[PDB]
């Protein structure tokens, strides 16, 4: 029998039959006039009423541009009001948003645009060159938020539209609404189909209930420095923030001065961070010149924090509950959330990544045997519930390998649950690398390396790094007669990928350590490092 773990919080009613917009704005009449988005770039503020209305106008605009239910748009933007209006606008149409880093190479963007079948790309003028040729050849519309080059439209063509021109649509709970890309537990980035039902469930698991797991309310100011094109910010900052009527303070990029100035000046109360931000707070000499006493909740996720740094950063935020959460794109994303964040808080231990969310089930499985494990025994973390993905777009094989027929998602993370129902992550079984919380899929990098005519074999694995948590390093087997150097390998990769995917070290070997069956012994390579 599977040994099943659940939250210390009771299950709640979740209205996951509601479309995401209908759910997120369900209580909007209670905070219509309250600030919703604050753009750190220009200090422009949109109220809840403004955001709902602009989203509805954009929906009508998108429909006029040809977006039908189940069509997809690509958002290729930094954190911005336009990101939000495009995402929620598509939701109103029963359509799908795929989201991508605007700093991706042209090849990276176009690959995602093709895989997702994006009909419209929403971007900035400076990035039009990345997609222009592709878009022209395939009649994909380009909409720019600042200025529109030839063959492009301005975003105002969407906001000029009449909100009463949203077509009648029957959106189903299992309809897809968000399509972030993720490599999962092996291989290349794949399209994660997140549904109305799934996202409503995940948001509710965090912020709903008499005692919510993550207590946020309409007088909070939540910093949105994490990128909305990644699932952490999209779900736990934007969608959760909207649900409870909180103000969301948008930053386009991390800048330590801007970060501190904004926290102090806007009296930020919720700080959704990642470990490298926590590291910057612990290291920077200017932090002591700032008043950060407004912050009541500091969250870290996406990568391990580690007891030491966690304990330390409580000093810089004297009034804050500090804790970790644990997410994975395929999981909706939140698997576990710190119960110190609850309206009626629980005791926690440093180094834990939370307690499994309510209205969900977790098990811990020995990778060697397939047997479920009891408390205080490490194995592969698995979760099930209505919050998880529908599956991978056009990839039933990858879906079948990732979620079993009993509904269990296998995370590829190794951890244990203690006597207090706190989850601790101790290792990663899957090949995924995390650079500052960003996904780096070794399979992508290995594919590039293998296609170099002077490389015979390659393996990319994480190396521990203070600043980034992990950096990608490559083990390379040179082809016969090859003289390719570490720098030449690095440059070859550097010219083809976004900065965070860059190989930081190259180690040249006679053979890649492989199992008898020829699978890369990634754990062995990690051990060598």
Ligand X SMILES: COC1=CC(/C=C/C(=O)OP(=O)(O)OC[C@H]2O[C@@H](n3cnc4c(N)ncnc43)[C@H](O)[C@@H]2O)=CCC1=O
Indicate the annotated binding residues for AMP: 325, 329, 413, 430, 434, 439
Residues 6+ apart with CB under 8 A from 345: 321, 339
Q: How far, CA to CA in Å, does 270 sit from each of 117, 321, 503? A: 36, 10, 34
8 A C-beta contact, residue 183 and residue 401: no
| C-alpha torsion angle, residues 85, 86, 87, 93 (rounded to 10) | 100
d(CA 51, CA 58): 10
Q: Which residues are annotated as a binding site for (E)-caffeoyl-AMP?
A: 232, 236, 302, 325, 329, 337, 413, 428, 430, 434
Backbone angles phi, psi at 275, to 5 degrees: -55, -40
d(CA 68, CA 167): 9
Q: Which residues are annotated as a binding site for (E)-feruloyl-AMP?
A: 232, 236, 302, 325, 329, 337, 413, 428, 430, 434
Q: Which is nearer to ligand X, 263 or 302 (CB)?
A: 302
Give contact residues for ligand X (rule: CB under 6 A): 182, 231-232, 235-236, 299, 301-304, 324-329, 333-334, 353, 411, 413, 425, 428, 434, 437, 439
Q: Please give the distance of CA 169 from its chain centroid, rounded to a whole number.
A: 28
Q: Which is nearer to ligand X, 144 or 425 (CB)?
A: 425
Q: Which is nearer to ligand X, 61 or 325 (CB)?
A: 325
Q: How far, CA to CA in Å, does 210 sit from each of 11, 206, 214, 246? A: 11, 12, 11, 18
Count of other CB atoms within 10 angstroms of residue 410 = 21
Least distance in Å: CB of 324 to ligand X?
A: 4
d(CA 77, CA 278): 25
Q: Which is nearer to ligand X, 423 or 512 (CB)?
A: 423
DSSP string, 135-179: HHHHT-EEEESS---TT-EETHHHHTS-GGGPPP----TTSEEE-
Q: Which is nearer to ligand X, 80 or 402 (CB)?
A: 402
Q: Give the position of tokens 């080059």.
A: 149
Number of helices and strands in the chain (H, E)? 16, 27
8 A C-beta contact, residue 269 and residue 294: yes
Q: Which is nearer to ligand X, 20 or 328 (CB)?
A: 328
Q: Which is nearer to ligand X, 40 or 241 (CB)?
A: 241
Least distance in Å: CB of 420 to ligand X?
A: 17
Least distance in Å: CB of 427 to ligand X?
A: 9
Report residue 230 as tokens. Answer: 């990644």
Q: Which residues are annotated as a binding site?
A: 182-186, 190, 232, 236, 253, 302, 324-325, 329, 337, 413, 428, 430, 434, 436-437, 439, 519
Least distance in Å: CB of 354 to ligand X?
A: 7
Residues 6+ apart with CB under 8 A from 380: 364, 365, 366, 367, 410, 411, 412, 413, 414, 429
d(CA 203, CA 236): 7
8 A C-beta contact, residue 156 and residue 58: no
d(CA 484, CA 493): 13
Least distance in Å: CB of 27 to ligand X?
A: 21
Name the CA radius of gyration of the chain, rounded: 23
Q: Which is nearer to ligand X, 249 or 425 (CB)?
A: 425
Least distance in Å: CB of 424 to ligand X?
A: 9
Least distance in Å: CB of 301 to ligand X?
A: 3
Strand partners, 191: 181
Least distance in Å: CB of 491 to ligand X?
A: 27
Q: Which is nearer to ligand X, 71 or 380 (CB)?
A: 380
Q: Which is nearer to ligand X, 58 or 339 (CB)?
A: 339
Least distance in Å: CB of 233 to ligand X?
A: 8
Q: Which is nearer to ligand X, 426 or 450 (CB)?
A: 426
Q: Which residues are annotated as a binding site for ATP?
A: 182-186, 190, 324-325, 329, 413, 428, 519
Least distance in Å: CB of 235 to ligand X?
A: 6
Strand partners, 204: none
Count of other CB atoms within 10 angstroms of residue 93 = 22
d(CA 34, CA 505): 50
Least distance in Å: CB of 155 to ligand X?
A: 28
Q: Which of 251, 244, 277, 275 is nearest to 265 (CA)?
A: 251
Backbone angles phi, psi at 143, to 5 degrees: -120, 125
Residues 6+ apart with CB under 8 A from 517: none
């Amino acid at each position: 029998v599977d040994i099943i773990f659940r939250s210390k919080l009771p299950d709640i009613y979740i209205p996951n039959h509601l479309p995401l917009h209908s759910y997120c704005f369900e209580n909007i009449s209670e905070f219509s006039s309250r600030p919703c988005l604050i753009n750190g770039a220009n200090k422009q503020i949109y109220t809840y009423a403004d955001v709902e209305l602009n989203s509805r106008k954009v929906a009508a605009g998108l429909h006029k541009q040809g977006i039908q239910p189940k069509d997809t748009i690509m958002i290729l933007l930094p954190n911005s009001p336009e990101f939000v209006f495009a995402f929620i606008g598509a939701s109103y149409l029963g359509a799908i948003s795929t989201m991508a880093n605007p700093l991706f190479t042209p090849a990276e963007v176009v690959k995602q645009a093709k895989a997702s079948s994006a009909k419209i790309i929403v971007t900035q003028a400076c990035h039009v060159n990345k997609v222009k040729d592709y878009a022209f050849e395939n009649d994909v519309k380009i909409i720019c938020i600042d200025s529109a080059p030839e063959g492009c439209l301005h975003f105002s063509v969407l906001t000029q539209a009449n909100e009463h021109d949203i077509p009648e649509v029957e959106i189903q709970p299992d309809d897809v609404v968000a399509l972030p890309y993720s490599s999962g537990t092996t291989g290349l980035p794949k399209g994660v189909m997140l549904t109305h039902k799934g996202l409503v469930t995940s948001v509710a698991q965090q912020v709903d209930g008499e005692n919510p797991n993550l207590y946020i309310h309409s007088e909070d100011v939540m910093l949105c420095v994490l990128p909305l094109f990644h699932i952490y910010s999209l779900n736990s900052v934007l969608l959760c923030g909207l649900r409870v009527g909180a103000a969301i303070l948008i930053m386009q990029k991390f800048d330590i001065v801007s970060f501190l100035e904004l926290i102090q000046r806007y009296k930020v109360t919720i700080g959704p961070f990642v470990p490298p931000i926590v590291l910057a707070i612990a290291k920077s000499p200017m932090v002591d010149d700032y008043d950060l006493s407004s912050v009541r909740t500091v969250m870290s996720g996406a990568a391990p924090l580690g007891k030491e740094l966690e304990d330390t950063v409580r000093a810089k935020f004297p009034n804050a509950k500090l804790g970790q959460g644990y997410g994975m794109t395929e999981a909706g994303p939140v698997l576990a959330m710190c119960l110190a964040f609850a309206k009626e808080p629980f005791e926690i231990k440093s180094g834990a990544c939370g307690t499994v969310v309510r209205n969900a089930e977790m098990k811990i499985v020995d990778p060697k045997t397939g047997n479920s494990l009891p408390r205080n025994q490490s194995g592969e973390i698995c979760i099930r519930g209505d919050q998880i993905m529908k599956g991978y777009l056009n990839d039933p094989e990858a879906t079948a390998r990732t979620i079993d027929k009993e509904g269990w998602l296998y995370t590829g993370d190794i951890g244990y649950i203690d006597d207090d129902d706190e989850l601790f992550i101790v290792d990663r079984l899957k090949e995924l690398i995390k650079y500052k919380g960003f996904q780096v899929a070794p399979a992508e990098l290995e594919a590039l390396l293998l296609n170099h005519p002077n490389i015979s074999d390659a393996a990319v694995v994480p190396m521990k790094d203070e600043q980034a948590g992990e950096v990608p390093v490559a083990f390379v087997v040179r082809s016969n007669g090859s003289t390719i150097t570490e720098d030449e390998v690095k440059d070859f990769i550097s010219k083809q990928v976004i900065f965070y995917k860059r190989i930081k070290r190259v180690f040249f070997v006679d053979a890649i350590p492989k199992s008898p069956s020829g699978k890369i012994l990634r754990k062995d390579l990690r051990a060598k490092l």
